[PDB]
Design a protein around this ligand. Structure first.
Ligand SMILES: O=C(CCCCCCC(=O)Nc1c[nH]c(=O)[nH]c1=O)NO
Length: 193
């Protein structure tokens, strides 16, 4: 259903879609605009990396991430959902750290092209599912705007190899994974002259 944790059965690491709407219908990331999917009384099930905040670093197996809202950010809505994934008691004043971070709730992570400029791992086209990550720690700090922002550190915890790795490339080749286009899209662009 909508609140399903973990990988979508039948959708392996390395699957690519050209548009966010295809990512929504696959179930990997259900919101078609919002960069994160979750519930404040539950966890976060998926998020997309598409640039956003320049202080975020993306290094493949680990990356930093900045929350949403709002003025100061609050540990509400999806900010709390992502925090609740961290294997630590929720703390909206100083953040928390999971000593046993692999026991936290999984997050499906897709990256989008517009994150390209401060991430060498963003795909050149469309969206790519990169596997399960886990919330290592989260903390509040003063952002570039001068207000408060909630930051997160996540790390990869997936049985399938990262798609950029040699072994992940072999799986993409062996599975036949290719850029998915909506039916008729390429045909409509070519007849438009
Ligand atoms: O870069 C990667 C992929 C390869 C890391 C896999 C094994 C290394 C590791 O297990 N080290 C750990 C250190 N400290 C912890 O607390 N827990 C750990 O599990 N990370 O996802």
């Amino acid at each position: 259903p909508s609140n399903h944790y973990g990988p979508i059965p039948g959708i392996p690491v390395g699957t690519m879609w050209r548009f966010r709407v295809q990512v929504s219908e696959s179930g990997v990331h259900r919101p078609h605009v919002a960069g994160i999917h979750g519930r404040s009384n539950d966890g976060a099930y998926s998020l997309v990396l598409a640039g956003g905040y320049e202080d975020d670093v993306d290094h493949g197996n680990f990356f930093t991430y900045t929350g949403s809202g709002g003025c100061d950010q609050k540990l509400t809505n999806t900010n709390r959902a992502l925090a609740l994934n961290c294997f630590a008691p929720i703390n909206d004043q100083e953040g928390a750290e999971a000593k046993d971070w692999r026991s936290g709730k999984p997050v499906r992570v897709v990256r989008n092209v517009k994150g390209g400029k401060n991430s060498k791992y963003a795909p050149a086209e469309g969206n790519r599912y990169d596997g399960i990550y886990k919330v290592v720690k989260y903390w509040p700090e003063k952002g570039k705007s001068g207000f408060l922002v909630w930051r997160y550190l996540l790390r990869r915890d997936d049985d399938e190899p990262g798609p950029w790795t040699k072994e992940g490339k072999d799986r993409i080749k062996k599975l036949g994974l290719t850029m998915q286009y909506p039916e008729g899209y390429l045909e409509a662009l070519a007849n438009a002259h």
